[PDB]
Amino acid sequence: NGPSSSDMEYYYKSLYPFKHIFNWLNHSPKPSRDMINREFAMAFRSGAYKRYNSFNSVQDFKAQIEKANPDRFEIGAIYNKPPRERDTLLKSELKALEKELVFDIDMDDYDAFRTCCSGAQVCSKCWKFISLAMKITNTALREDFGYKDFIWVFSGRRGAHCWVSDKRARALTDVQRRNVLDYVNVIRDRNTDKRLALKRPYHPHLARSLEQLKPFFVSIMLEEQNPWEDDQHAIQTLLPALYDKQLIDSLKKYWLDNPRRSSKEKWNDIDQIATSLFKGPKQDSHIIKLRECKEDLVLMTLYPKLDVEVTKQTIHLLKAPFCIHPATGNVCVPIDESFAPEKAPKLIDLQTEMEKNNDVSLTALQPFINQFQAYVSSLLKNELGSVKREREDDDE
């Protein structure tokens, strides 16, 4: 049951930060191609879906959204002509030039490895998977790519979205976004059935990420989530990560014979049984292989699971920050690694608060708006300072 058309209309009229979002996407206060040629899509309570909208100014943006009153809207690429002029129409036609580099983490992708919620439900406990996803992704963004202007935003329900605004990130072609994705998407076939068998020696990014995540593995996976106490799930998602049929078969039998041993007990069984099985002349080679499999398992469970096509496609549409999620009533607020999903402002609560306080500015959403304004101001400085660096290079 979604919030009413009138609650949504009044949210747009009163609280949605149209100016700051416009400026964020335009990269300047003065309307440019970066907004005038940018696609927005709108989704309606009815299932209708309208692509190829575009807005000229803060007031045009606000007006069209107010008038349409969609449940959500999605931001797209910056094109060579205005998307709303599609239909009339075909230059060659409509060509994508640039767009923010985005990353999307959906918690249901971790459902094999969490037990506290499944599907489109989340809580503070399993949100830790998102926080780790941020830590890892942020590390690659800053350290390896040297991107500096990025923000994470709550999706309203299932996870978080990362928006990279750095000029050179926006400039990426479809191939280059696939190469960025490939670099950060260490884990392949989101198993099971099989073993990741990641390459070795580990590439430096994997090595780093492993070292970042390992300290969390026992607490999150073995203790909090404990997905492998359920034997069928251990057989389905723990054992296929191992390298040896005999070891697999032995563990399987042992857990069939002694059911419901905890994830911590099972993690230890792997070692004990492999030790008895492989003591020999080649025991050193099995010691190494098993370790590699367990490291890979740390990655398989805790390393960010990205919604890959979201990142790979320059034209891809993604929900705008500060939209309301109609299913949850949540506002899609900017976030960091301290975020609880229980902590997202709810639209109904904000509307009560603003009437109680008889002032639009006196809601729990204001601090998120203020922080976003501050972020945007910094971005605008950097965009301008970049053309200032072009001048400083040209100063010769």
Side-chain angles (χ1 to χ4, degrees), residues 185-189 195-203 206 210 292-293 295-300 303:
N185 189 37
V186 318
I187 94 94
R188 4 136 71 208
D189 304 359
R195 204 157 59 63
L196 286 180
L198 298 175
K199 68 241 105 90
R200 294 183 181 277
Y202 268 5
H203 169 284
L206 270 79
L210 182 68
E292 288 185 0
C293 292
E295 293 177 350
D296 284 15
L297 266 157
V298 172
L299 295 195
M300 179 52 92
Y303 187 92

Coordinates of all heavy atoms in Angstrom, one line a residue, residues 185-189 195-203 206 210 292-293 295-300 303:
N185 N 34.6 -6.1 -10.1 CA 33.7 -7.2 -9.9 C 34.5 -8.5 -9.9 O 34.4 -9.4 -10.8 CB 32.7 -7.3 -11.1 CG 31.6 -8.3 -10.9 OD1 31.1 -8.5 -9.8 ND2 31.2 -9.0 -12.0
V186 N 35.2 -8.7 -8.8 CA 36.1 -9.8 -8.7 C 35.3 -11.1 -8.8 O 35.8 -12.1 -9.4 CB 37.0 -9.8 -7.4 CG1 37.6 -8.3 -7.1 CG2 36.4 -10.4 -6.2
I187 N 34.1 -11.2 -8.3 CA 33.5 -12.5 -8.3 C 32.4 -12.8 -9.3 O 31.3 -12.3 -9.3 CB 33.1 -13.0 -6.9 CG1 31.7 -12.6 -6.5 CG2 34.2 -12.5 -5.9 CD1 30.8 -13.7 -6.8
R188 N 32.8 -13.8 -10.1 CA 32.3 -14.3 -11.4 C 30.8 -14.8 -11.6 O 30.0 -14.2 -12.4 CB 33.2 -15.4 -11.9 CG 34.2 -15.8 -10.8 CD 34.3 -17.3 -10.6 NE 34.9 -18.0 -11.8 CZ 34.7 -19.3 -12.1 NH1 33.8 -20.1 -11.4 NH2 35.3 -19.8 -13.2
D189 N 30.6 -15.9 -11.1 CA 29.4 -16.7 -11.4 C 28.5 -16.8 -10.3 O 27.7 -17.8 -10.2 CB 29.8 -18.0 -12.0 CG 30.7 -17.9 -13.2 OD1 31.1 -16.7 -13.6 OD2 31.1 -18.9 -13.7
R195 N 33.4 -23.5 -7.5 CA 34.4 -22.8 -6.9 C 34.8 -21.6 -7.7 O 34.9 -21.7 -8.9 CB 35.6 -23.7 -6.7 CG 36.5 -23.4 -5.6 CD 37.3 -24.6 -5.1 NE 38.1 -25.2 -6.2 CZ 39.1 -24.6 -6.8 NH1 39.5 -23.4 -6.4 NH2 39.7 -25.3 -7.7
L196 N 35.0 -20.4 -7.1 CA 35.5 -19.2 -7.8 C 36.9 -19.5 -8.4 O 37.1 -19.0 -9.5 CB 35.7 -18.1 -6.8 CG 34.4 -17.4 -6.3 CD1 34.7 -16.2 -5.4 CD2 33.6 -16.8 -7.5
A197 N 37.7 -20.2 -7.7 CA 39.0 -20.6 -8.3 C 39.7 -19.3 -8.8 O 40.2 -19.3 -9.9 CB 38.9 -21.6 -9.4
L198 N 39.6 -18.2 -8.1 CA 40.1 -16.9 -8.5 C 41.5 -17.1 -8.9 O 42.2 -18.1 -8.4 CB 39.9 -15.9 -7.4 CG 38.5 -15.6 -6.9 CD1 38.5 -14.6 -5.8 CD2 37.6 -15.0 -8.1
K199 N 42.1 -16.3 -9.8 CA 43.4 -16.4 -10.2 C 44.5 -16.2 -9.1 O 44.4 -15.3 -8.3 CB 43.7 -15.6 -11.5 CG 43.7 -14.1 -11.4 CD 42.6 -13.4 -12.2 CE 41.4 -12.9 -11.4 NZ 41.6 -11.5 -11.0
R200 N 45.6 -16.7 -9.2 CA 46.7 -16.6 -8.2 C 48.1 -16.6 -9.0 O 48.2 -17.3 -10.0 CB 46.6 -17.7 -7.2 CG 45.4 -17.7 -6.2 CD 45.3 -18.7 -5.2 NE 44.0 -18.5 -4.4 CZ 43.9 -17.7 -3.3 NH1 44.9 -17.0 -2.9 NH2 42.8 -17.6 -2.7
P201 N 48.9 -15.9 -8.3 CA 48.5 -15.2 -7.1 C 47.5 -14.1 -7.3 O 47.4 -13.5 -8.4 CB 49.9 -14.5 -6.7 CG 50.9 -15.1 -7.6 CD 50.2 -15.6 -8.9
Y202 N 46.7 -13.9 -6.3 CA 45.8 -12.8 -6.2 C 46.4 -11.5 -6.8 O 47.5 -11.1 -6.5 CB 45.4 -12.5 -4.7 CG 44.2 -13.2 -4.2 CD1 43.5 -14.1 -5.0 CD2 43.7 -13.0 -2.9 CE1 42.3 -14.8 -4.5 CE2 42.6 -13.6 -2.4 CZ 41.9 -14.5 -3.2 OH 40.8 -15.1 -2.7
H203 N 45.6 -10.8 -7.6 CA 45.9 -9.4 -8.0 C 45.9 -8.5 -6.8 O 45.2 -8.7 -5.9 CB 44.8 -9.0 -9.1 CG 44.9 -7.6 -9.4 ND1 44.4 -6.6 -8.5 CD2 45.4 -6.9 -10.5 CE1 44.6 -5.4 -9.1 NE2 45.2 -5.6 -10.3
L206 N 42.5 -7.7 -5.1 CA 42.0 -8.8 -4.4 C 42.7 -9.0 -3.0 O 42.0 -9.3 -2.0 CB 42.1 -10.1 -5.2 CG 40.9 -10.5 -6.1 CD1 41.0 -9.6 -7.4 CD2 40.9 -12.0 -6.4
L210 N 40.7 -8.8 0.4 CA 40.7 -9.9 1.3 C 41.1 -9.5 2.7 O 40.5 -9.8 3.7 CB 41.8 -11.0 0.9 CG 41.8 -12.2 1.7 CD1 40.5 -13.0 1.6 CD2 43.0 -13.1 1.4
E292 N 43.4 -21.3 0.0 CA 43.0 -20.6 -1.1 C 41.4 -20.6 -1.3 O 40.8 -19.6 -1.5 CB 43.7 -21.1 -2.4 CG 45.2 -20.7 -2.5 CD 45.9 -21.1 -3.8 OE1 45.2 -21.7 -4.7 OE2 47.1 -20.9 -3.9
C293 N 40.9 -21.8 -1.2 CA 39.4 -22.0 -1.2 C 38.7 -21.2 -0.1 O 37.6 -20.6 -0.4 CB 39.0 -23.5 -1.1 SG 39.5 -24.5 -2.5
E295 N 39.8 -18.5 1.4 CA 40.0 -17.1 1.1 C 38.9 -16.7 0.0 O 38.3 -15.6 0.1 CB 41.4 -16.8 0.6 CG 42.4 -17.0 1.7 CD 43.9 -16.8 1.2 OE1 44.1 -16.7 -0.1 OE2 44.8 -16.7 2.0
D296 N 38.8 -17.5 -0.9 CA 37.9 -17.2 -2.0 C 36.5 -17.2 -1.4 O 35.6 -16.4 -1.8 CB 37.9 -18.3 -3.1 CG 39.1 -18.1 -4.0 OD1 40.1 -17.3 -3.7 OD2 39.2 -18.8 -5.1
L297 N 36.2 -18.0 -0.4 CA 34.9 -18.0 0.3 C 34.6 -16.7 1.0 O 33.5 -16.2 1.1 CB 34.8 -19.2 1.2 CG 34.1 -20.4 0.6 CD1 34.5 -21.7 1.4 CD2 32.6 -20.2 0.7
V298 N 35.7 -16.2 1.6 CA 35.5 -14.9 2.2 C 35.1 -13.8 1.2 O 34.1 -13.0 1.4 CB 36.8 -14.4 2.9 CG1 36.7 -13.0 3.4 CG2 37.1 -15.3 4.1
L299 N 35.7 -13.9 0.0 CA 35.3 -12.9 -1.0 C 33.9 -13.2 -1.5 O 33.1 -12.3 -1.5 CB 36.3 -13.0 -2.2 CG 37.8 -12.6 -1.8 CD1 38.6 -12.4 -3.1 CD2 37.7 -11.3 -1.0
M300 N 33.6 -14.5 -1.8 CA 32.3 -14.9 -2.3 C 31.1 -14.4 -1.3 O 30.0 -14.2 -1.8 CB 32.2 -16.4 -2.4 CG 30.8 -17.0 -2.8 SD 30.1 -16.2 -4.3 CE 30.7 -17.3 -5.6
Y303 N 32.5 -9.8 -0.3 CA 32.9 -8.8 -1.3 C 31.7 -8.2 -2.0 O 30.7 -9.0 -2.2 CB 33.9 -9.5 -2.3 CG 34.5 -8.5 -3.2 CD1 35.7 -7.9 -2.9 CD2 33.8 -8.1 -4.4 CE1 36.2 -7.0 -3.8 CE2 34.3 -7.2 -5.2 CZ 35.6 -6.6 -4.9 OH 36.1 -5.7 -5.8

